[PDB]
């Protein structure tokens, strides 16, 4: 996805260059995260989200944890809405940082404030937190 393609996806966003800038930073460092424009809740509510996996080390090995980061049209002033997206080979683990719907809860999202808070910082936190408590486990 080129910068031009990203600009199109966020046409209705309030802070476009800022959203594109960070998205590029994210997909450049985390190559398995892909920007996708999809409807959220309502067919007319299209938002861009970063969907894919992030590398997380746990008890010895690295796992490609499936996530989805929805960027609201107010990004970066408001935090993204994040979810763990389990595949058929795994099961989501409800716990401290993951609720019944797979929504992620983190102090980083709770006190989110631009410009110090950003997606690179968020993903870094996820790698540390999920490395301690995986949000998904492979089926037996």
């Amino acid at each position: 996805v080129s910068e031009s393609q990203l600009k199109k996806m966020v046409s209705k966003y309030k802070y476009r260059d800022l959203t594109v800038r960070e998205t590029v930073n994210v997909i450049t460092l985390y190559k398995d995260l892909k920007p996708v424009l999809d409807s959220y809740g309502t067919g007319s509510r299209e938002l861009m989200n970063l969907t894919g996996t992030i590398p997380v080390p746990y008890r010895g090995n690295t796992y490609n944890i499936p996530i989805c980061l929805w960027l609201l049209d107010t990004y970066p002033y408001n935090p993204p809405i994040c979810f763990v997206k389990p595949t058929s080979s795994m099961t989501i683990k409800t716990g401290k940082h993951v609720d019944a719907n797979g929504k992620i809860y983190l102090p980083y999202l709770h006190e989110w404030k631009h410009p110090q808070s950003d997606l690179l910082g968020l993903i870094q936190v996820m790698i540390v937190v999920f490395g301690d408590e995986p949000p998904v486990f492979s089926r037996p």
Binding site: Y63, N64, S89, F137, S138
Partner: peptide, 9 residues
């Protein structure tokens, strides 16, 4: 590439 998760525990 392919999503993976640690063994059930």
């Amino acid at each position: 590439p392919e999503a993976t998760a640690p063994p059930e525990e």
